[PDB]
Design a binder for this molecule. Structure first.
Ligand SMILES: CCC1=C(C)/C(=C/C2=NC(=C\c3[nH]c(/C=C4\NC(=O)[C@H](C)[C@H]4CC)c(C)c3CCC(=O)O)/C(CCC(=O)O)=C2C)NC1=O
Ligand SMILES: CCC1=C(C)/C(=C/C2=NC(=C\c3[nH]c(/C=C4\NC(=O)[C@H](C)[C@H]4CC)c(C)c3CCC(=O)O)/C(CCC(=O)O)=C2C)NC1=O
Lengths: 147, 146
């Protein structure tokens, strides 16, 4: 964050670098777009989740938890997008591969997640900038289940 | 702020509400303007600092330390502006007036700080919002010195 960047600059007795400034400038300026994205994923959260669950419907034994988890995945994506901090996804998906490996099916989860991503993207057809943001964050989520 | 309202929604296992989204909208917009300001001040810092030194050059007995401090002051102003937190200035200015009244002239430092302000402001004559933002942070710098 800003307070982060400032702390290290201070630590090194210096002005923020041109790069640090540009990076913060871009973080603030993409803010409106990131909020637009979150508002949209949120209001459509239920349709996005049910599309993902449906795609693996026949693989699911625990539908209540499946629907819950898929909603939670999308909710943390949504946090990360609002904060402009992909690490929110990383911290909160820590260890989930093992847990869901064991709980149901790793294969299926990735299938559902890919549908979370596709269904999410579907709301930004006209808006390449947003689609990129959405794909970047969704890819961070999925990758935490791949390698 | 980013982490704060997200932390709450997180604790309550929910999506951010529309009211939360609008509040962040205001945060990011202001941050954008603050960052534009900080970039200008940073890129033109040598110029700003030299104007301020030059404005009191007759009183300066140590050009080096004077140029250093004025830069140090400007630096902390930019930190405050970037974070949007005037208290960065307050905290790092604490007790400084005494150290510097000793070292040279408290009063010349004030004149030079007014020139830091006046010089900083010259980059924002087309943008009265940004100008007011620079004036408000610089005033905290000058005041907490006095
Ligand atoms: C990133 C945010 C986040 C997620 C997603 C999360 C998931 C998560 N899923 C869990 C269990 C589970 N998850 C599922 C199933 C599924 N899960 C899926 O994402 C699939 C759609 C489906 C497998 C097909 C099942 C069947 C269990 C354990 C069932 C139980 O004993 O109740 C558990 C173990 C504790 C619990 O049962 O609640 C966690 C922590 N925790 C988090 O903080
Ligand atoms: C907000 C960030 C910040 C500032 C500004 C700061 C100033 C500061 N100026 C100092 C000294 C000094 N400062 C100056 C001069 C001046 N100082 C001025 O701001 C005037 C423009 C000019 C007098 C006209 C002089 C001559 C010394 C004594 C250093 C020496 O004797 O070599 C000292 C004493 C220790 C040192 O020499 O490093 C500090 C701590 N410290 C900080 O953490």
């Amino acid at each position: 964050l800003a307070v982060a960047t400032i702390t290290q600059a201070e630590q090194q007795d210096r002005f923020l670098g041109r790069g640090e400034l540009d990076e913060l400038a871009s973080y603030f300026a993409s803010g409106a777009k990131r909020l637009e994205i979150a508002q949209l994923l949120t209001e459509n959260s239920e349709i996005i989740v049910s599309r993902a669950a449906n795609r693996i419907f026949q693989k699911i034994e625990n539908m209540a938890k499946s629907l819950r988890d898929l909603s939670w995945f999308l909710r943390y994506a949504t946090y990360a997008i609002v904060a402009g901090d992909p690490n929110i996804i990383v911290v909160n998906t820590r260890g989930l591969r093992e847990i869901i490996e064991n709980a149901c099916s790793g294969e299926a989860t990735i299938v559902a997640l890919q549908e979370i991503k596709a269904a999410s993207l579907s709301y930004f057809r006209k808006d390449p900038e947003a689609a990129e943001i959405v794909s970047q964050y969704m890819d961070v989520l999925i990758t935490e289940f791949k390698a």
